[PDB]
Amino acid sequence: KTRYYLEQCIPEMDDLVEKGLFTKNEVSLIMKKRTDFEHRLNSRGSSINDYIKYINYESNVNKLRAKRCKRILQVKKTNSLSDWSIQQRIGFIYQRGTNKFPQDLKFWAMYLNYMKARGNQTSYKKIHNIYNQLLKLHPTNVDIWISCAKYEYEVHANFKSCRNIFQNGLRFNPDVPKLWYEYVKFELNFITKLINRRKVMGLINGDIALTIFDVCMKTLGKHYINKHKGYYAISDSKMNIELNKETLNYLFSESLRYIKLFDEFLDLERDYLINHVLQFWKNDMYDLSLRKDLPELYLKTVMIDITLNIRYMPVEKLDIDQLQLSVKKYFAYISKLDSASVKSLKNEYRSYLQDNYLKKMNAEDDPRYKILDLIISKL
């Protein structure tokens, strides 16, 4: 049906000769270059590269017409079919290429980027149809779910729709830590903008994330348990204890990543948010106690807690009392720890104090340099 496609180009080109932008010979050349391509697209062995070349070739022809419009007609826009035909045509290649080769995610992205650029020409409803179609074809690709969520939270700032994307994405892909990580990121991004708007509102006159974090664990653990067993359960008790361990070590890593994530956001009470993560790991999980079986994780858990009260004050605002509270915490944990752990914790706590506060301090001017040095000598 190549001829039907060729005949569709006739009305646009009758316009181009009529406006005088393109002479019948240059007209003839454009049709010959087109005609070779639809045969390429409609013929057996057509590859996605062929569609890209037309989109590039048709893209160029738009540039020539725009320049000749100002050069010859001396008009920004001539009210005729030529103005929107090429953009309309370039789109039509995109649907056919996407329909013909749904696999190639690169071509899809070119499709979205092209029409996203021409927001006026292409309504945002037309974005959602393709995303609905694309997401429908690849529900398991996390990158797409974040793509539409990111698009509608920045260009449109529709948190409700953006929230639904994560909810439906996590429904399809609950085993991907990345999607949870981004969904928590969006959740806090909504909060920080809200409080900042509240601050702006005053000038001119979060727990929800923690729930995501908590549920984020439970699914990831179940899925990580589901993997490494395969179809069946594991008969050996020792191996089951291991499978519990790789989960706890695995689950410990995502909890640590979210701890890094909290630091980014200054407005939120990171100490309160972090403490909830600390209170989370105090609870025994999967019949395993962190203190007895995995001391190394427990030491990192303690190291955060002892430095929790002293983590976020600058060097200028370090008060002696909270430092005293920190060292009292450190001594309390020593009495309940074995000798090997105490030495490791002593080294880590000593390094933390030296790097964060002492090295950034003038020894001669500030009296609290001497208190800090005495504490570390005593640690």
């Binding site: 995610l105 690169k106 992205a109 070119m110 979205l112 980027n113 690709n141 990158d143 797409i144 974040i146 793509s147 969520a149 990111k150 939270y153 981004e182 990121k185 969006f186 991004n189």
Partner: peptide
């Protein structure tokens, strides 16, 4: 939120013969 999708845009049955 970070997405790489936008960045990605740019014979067994034969017997022996005598």
């Amino acid at each position: 939120l970070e997405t790489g999708f936008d960045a990605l845009a740019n014979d067994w049955f034969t017997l022996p013969k005598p």
